[PDB]
Write a protein that binds this ligand. Sequence first.
Ligand code: HEM
Ligand code: HEM
Lengths: 443, 443
Amino acid sequence: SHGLFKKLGIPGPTPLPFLGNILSYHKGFCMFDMECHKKYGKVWGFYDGQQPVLAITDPDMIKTVLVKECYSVFTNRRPFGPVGFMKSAISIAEDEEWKRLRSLLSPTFTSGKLKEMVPIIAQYGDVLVRNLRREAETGKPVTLKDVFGAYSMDVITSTSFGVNIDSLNNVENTKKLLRFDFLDPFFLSITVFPFLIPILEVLNICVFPREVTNFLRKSVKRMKDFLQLMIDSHKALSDLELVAQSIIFIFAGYETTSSVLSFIMYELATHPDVQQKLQEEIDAVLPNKAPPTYDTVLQMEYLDMVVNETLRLFPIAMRLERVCKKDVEINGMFIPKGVVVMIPSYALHRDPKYWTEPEKFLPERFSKKNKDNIDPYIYTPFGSGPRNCIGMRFALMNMKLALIRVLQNFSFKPCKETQIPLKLSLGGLLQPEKPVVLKVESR
Amino acid sequence: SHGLFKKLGIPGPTPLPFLGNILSYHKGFCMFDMECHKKYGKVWGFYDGQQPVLAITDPDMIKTVLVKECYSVFTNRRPFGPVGFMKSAISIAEDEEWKRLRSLLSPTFTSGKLKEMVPIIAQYGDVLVRNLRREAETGKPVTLKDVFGAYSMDVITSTSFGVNIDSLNNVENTKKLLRFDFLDPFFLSITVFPFLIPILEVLNICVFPREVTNFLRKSVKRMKDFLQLMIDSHKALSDLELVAQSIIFIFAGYETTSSVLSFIMYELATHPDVQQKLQEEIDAVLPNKAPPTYDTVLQMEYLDMVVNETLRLFPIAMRLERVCKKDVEINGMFIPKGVVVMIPSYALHRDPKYWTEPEKFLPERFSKKNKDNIDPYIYTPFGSGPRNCIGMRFALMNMKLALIRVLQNFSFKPCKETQIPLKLSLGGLLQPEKPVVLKVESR
Ligand code: HEM
Ligand code: HEM
């Protein structure tokens, strides 16, 4: 299989037997994508073990894959690995099963359901503030991912299950047992030995820990709006499949939001003029520290620009991927069946062809003047098409609500322990090498 | 997975952990199907390892599976196992790849191409006769599968590749290395360890021997009408995929025809009145030992009845199977995705509900009077629907041509070594326990 791109005339790094190009992931696959783009141009191919992967960067071709030919050709992501019952999670499911799950779970994220959650998640924005004042009087720098993770977990639990637990002063199975998720050498052996995935499945081995899953399974059992929207009810949902969607939302609510929130606060700390301008917008829109509402959040243009520019620099998804279901010929190029088509979001977000000074944090990229010159298929922090991020609206609103409440009360500065410039971890996930610590001063 | 049929309300034999019901194959799976039909009625379910299999016997439901819902639900047979490049063989391919192969190879078996082969395969019918006279003068009984296999291999090679080799006096890679195909304990371990199939594939392990495949690969290479119909040319064929179809046809030409021919000659030997009546029809239609033609073969009604009644007693395919592609509800019954739907041809052919005295060889079942009372979905020796036997017309013509030439010259009788009644082998394939030996006397 390692002669595919050579026969297609498609350039790429020469693969090694068995391993493919996975050894070039020593720099992390975000640096691999950037170097491959620089060296091979618009399109290139490489191998994850034996799996051929075709990387595309042309906006026309990206839109054809993500949007135009989603249902007919590019329906599914690359198979997850040994999952067990998590095969029914929406982000893992394939074909008509995903179509049903996407249709059944879409009502959860409507702007009507979104407006209902804002009074619920503003109560934790005040607990988050009080928790911040505790360490603000301490005088020593704060670890943001701890307090933001507690906030994000509190928000996702109550909005999903209606359970209200202050995480910082306590909460274990969730959060404390949701974090885990290591960069094991097991995942590397999965791509080198993908033929072993059916072995681990029959041994009831899964990447998820069996004790937390059975906790949620029995947690939702004694639980007898997202939890309501599935219960009150294509085809009706199942009990064990009920739990699968909860794990995704919990992980997406906790891990994603709190990681991006820490990146934003880092950028605000290292750019005080941006922090001051954002604080001035918040005080103008919400005079006298008025509580943020659904409609006031949507009125803050500079807040939207700061969130967007941070998601440009740190697209936590790093890559978009779709499995080619059949032989196709897109935009003048032929894709054989079984090839994983990959869009390197991280490299595209930092490409000098579309971004001026791409490494610099400049929110004015997303101003109403310059936003029209931004291609929606180069800048894809939430993906695109029918399989984009279903919680995009919730994530943006959840992050902005936390940012407003936090900046109304505090200003953030670098401390002696702050890593400047921030160094990204090379172990897969888009996270800082050192945890982000910042000085917090009450306004 | 072993609780599926219990939750469906579908009866069946209680499966063992890991193994399923495969231990009940000690009697051979043809006896297993007959006993299950007798015990559980119209429908039942069992497990090949972890694989659930649903057996159906209602003619309405069979027609829905084989004919009505072939392209939408029941397109593919159960996956073959470790195949290697033989995954592109038409009888193994799935979905649109099978559709292309079925469309590209259908012109091989037209009645026009069939009429062209009759003058070609009549030359071996005369070599077969001369070979038979040699052992007829010997005076000792003859092993039919040897002389019929040589004939069938000669016919399939010349009709497929245009190569003309007298097999009996010689031919090795083909035939002598085509037979092999043992009832290994490896196939049993395949169903118990179906998760290991991707392991054997990556180790370049296949059920087919690697030396014969590369012989045909290089045989057809120096070969630079079936071989012509693919070369002279949906999507064009491939070199390594060229060889895959040749292996199927060679195996189907050799193994299938010669096994059924031996069953027919056994029945003729143990029913002299049937043999005499058939000989009288052949002498009436072809006076003075006239060579059989395409049109004279189709005129022999009693010849057709004898072939059909033998295929009722010995349907060498034993089972028809289709993988359920999606959740469906057929004829008032719900089939979940991934269940193998199986039609037990052997048991249906010997069911007292449709056949009087089912164990008895009675060609008058298929007379023009009684043939109308035969359901085409109970009697399915060549399958049915778009995925039936593509070589049905060729096989029937090839067998009848051999039978005519053989019975014009010889009469067949049991000898002291003849096994009466014939005992079927319990090791999977529908073949006699003892090889069929018969006394051959020149007319
Ligand atoms: C800053 C926060 C987030 C970012 C940047 C983000 C980004 C993404 C991206 C890029 C995808 C893949 C899109 C594609 O393949 O085209 C995705 C998928 C998904 N996200 Fe998010 N996401 C975020 C937060 C969330 C949240 C808070 C939730 C739920 C509470 C969520 C639920 C999902 C689901 C269910 C999918 C899979 C959808 C499907 O396969 O149909 N995400 N996300
Ligand atoms: C007495 C002789 C034969 C019998 C009883 C027989 C029976 C069958 C049956 C029952 C099937 C499966 C049908 C289904 O699944 O519905 C089949 C498939 C097939 N047979 Fe035969 N067959 C015979 C001879 C031959 C010959 C001589 C050839 C070629 C030279 C051949 C080529 C094929 C092929 C290619 C398939 C698979 C077709 C597909 O999957 O589309 N068969 N046969």
